[model samples]
Target: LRHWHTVVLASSDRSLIEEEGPFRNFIQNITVESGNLNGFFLTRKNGQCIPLYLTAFKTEEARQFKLNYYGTNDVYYESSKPNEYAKFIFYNYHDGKVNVVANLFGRTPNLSNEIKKRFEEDFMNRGFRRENILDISEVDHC
Candidate 1:
């Protein structure tokens, strides 16, 4: 019954909606070369890195892949690939808006308390509002 814990956020910032802007910059800066899997590590200026294993993806590619594999236009409802330990998406609508989505896997179908706490805290610290964040996985399944 293992599943992904998904969180979605909507933002109105145009700067954050750009491909090479703060959202992408943050991901690139946090990425570290680990064994074989390159992952995002939340680090401090003092160089303390916390391995979050948060992988980022473009919505365009995800949409195309979903259309081909699942025969559905809905990319958000689909689960992670077998190779994806965890995945995230920064979808920019180009209408002065963007969507920040994260998918964290758990040992069960439901989101774990520990993962939920960390994910919410990290996203909120990054300027994503709690009210704007939606648990799409729950919505999809229901």
Candidate 2:
């Protein structure tokens, strides 16, 4: 039972964070350009806080994106289509050893809040207690 947070979006985003997360931040906005797009970053109230600028989109139509700004191989750009899922894992490194792990995932296309709630309940019942839950914002509703 590790303490954590899960920010689930009903639909998806042209660019956003995962459900389980950086467990630290939320998405702010995304701006598309000619063959390129810009991703804005945000975070939860009591978690890691910082702003990131991303410009990597796997496809022209990708809607979901993940940014790893606080890790050894920190990246500022990654993209996924809306409705797809993206997972970000934060790791800890010791004297050449892996330490802890943090996971985050995005929802599939047309996902419903009801489904998310049910999943969380089922997950908890199954002994997965260290999790956080967040609903998709109106702007993120596909």
Candidate 3:
């Protein structure tokens, strides 16, 4: 029964980043690494199970990927280029509310100005502050 929102994350607060609490601890342990495999996958050597939702819609022009969970929750992805940069906006529906947290990731730790700027612009234009986006590229993922 493990899903994305099973753990407390993506708190709906518009101002604070929810830097503390269960979401913070959850976020710290979660990381995105690009690779193969799909659906349910076991992790580490601890036999921990994490389910990966394999559904996504990739548009041609905007290069946007819209991924939705079983209900109203969604996670939007926009890549500035092919296989180079990745930006993720998590819109999770739980607590009977939708929580948003925009994030930026990379194929490598080194990111270009193009995607970096794009991430800032879109995140800001969405009424989010420039500081909202987490530079996940700088961290290590599971």
Candidate 4:
């Protein structure tokens, strides 16, 4: 296992957080455009984009949604904004490789997939390489 020591992500939207509280903080910039969903980009200090911990909510259902929908639960559901939900990625400090996650919410999985694809394409346009990211392995709820 590769060991990574640090991680960073763009801050979430304040308005969204205020309206929804911590539930929206776990998602960077949750929004929809032209019927497509998009979220914030997570990165290391060097600006290397990392996968999101799609399910960082505090509630059980929230955690389950993250794990089942996105595949991993590396995110932290914080009482404070930018509460270091991603601490595990660095704290574990494996061999430098870490699993990435993304939150895709919709009425169904197929819709989520399409939105995810489009989101990924747009994300790549911003200088992120699609290959560098690892597949979301587990979306743990508990």
Candidate 5:
């Protein structure tokens, strides 16, 4: 069975690293492993650490190469780059005062529904209001 590393980030700014802003450090600082993979390490305000790693195909050109390796379609919402293989879900709360970003990275193409649902539930239980969630599915070529 393949394992996955899910990282949840809390930020006042909704913009991700790819965009122009302070969040770039949040995205760029994450380490990307060799062998066509991308990832990073996340440290929470309390000093808790989480590591995230996903296939490099999160890129447009690279995704075409492994189109059929996995069956389930990976979905992402409210991300700067929606088409990327990784999943980034954003939740805004306190009248848009804060944002909670959930990032899922794994070896497989798609994450199980049970896992996604549970994650959302956990987020809600933590007092985060789901303001605008977007779901972008993978484009099936085969």
Candidate 6:
């Protein structure tokens, strides 16, 4: 019900974010709520935006992927602004290791340098290269 903008995105794998990459923001217009989720992932370029349902648990197990489909997400500072800004760390297991995609969304389109830099350090501390974290705030369409 609230509107937020995609401000940052970080990933360990280049293929996931490269131009014309398979999963590069293919999942868009995502709406996440505590109870459950109802969202959309634009299937193709200039194509249909299909509905995607999501949950925090699967098979009675708990996880917090933004969509809970591909990986897991953890939120931070959720109380300070309450949906004004959020970071979703979606990390999935693949390619013999765990890959992570840290996404930042905000009520406003752009974020402070400190927050953005912190996001870079976050995934970098895990396994991604420093350059691997992307500033997709402008390219983020949905």
Q: How many pairs of residues collide in each model?
A: 0, 10, 0, 15, 3, 0
Candidates in order, TM-scores: namely: 0.36, 0.35, 0.48, 0.24, 0.32, 0.65
Name the best candidate (by TM-score). Answer: 6
**Stretches of candidate 5 above 4 Å error?**
1-100, 132-134, 138-142
Candidate 6's TM-score: 0.65
Q: How many backbone clashes does candidate 1 have?
A: 0
For candidate 5, what is the TM-score?
A: 0.32
How far is each candidate from the true structure, as Cα RMSD in Å? 15.8, 10.4, 8.4, 17.3, 15.5, 4.4
Return the lDDT, model 3, position 16.
Answer: 29
lDDT of each: 0.37, 0.38, 0.43, 0.30, 0.36, 0.55
User: Candidate 6 residues 1-142, lDDT tens each?
Assistant: 2465557767778777666443455334444455344444343345544443344332233334333444444322222445556665665654446666666766677888887777677677776677776676766453
lDDT of 4 by residue, 42-138 (tens): 3332324344543223334331222222223334222121221222211111245333333332221123344345545654565656653222312
What's the C-alpha lDDT at position 123 in model 2? 40
- Per-residue CA lDDT of model 1 for 1-142, tens digit only, reads 1233333323334334233323322222223222122334222223343334443223454332121211122223233443332434333343444344443444333454555566567767887666644443354321
lDDT of the structure predicted as candidate 6:
0.55
Once superposed on the true structure, which residue ranges of model 2 sit more than 4 Å away at CA? 1-22, 32-37, 44-50, 55-68, 72-112, 118-127, 130-142
Over the full model, what C-alpha lDDT does candidate 1 score relative to the true structure?
0.37
Q: Clashing residue pairs in candidate 1, if any?
A: none
- The order of the candidates by TM-score, greatest first, is 6, 3, 1, 2, 5, 4
lDDT of 5 by residue, 45-89 (tens): 333434333342343443221211113223233332333324444
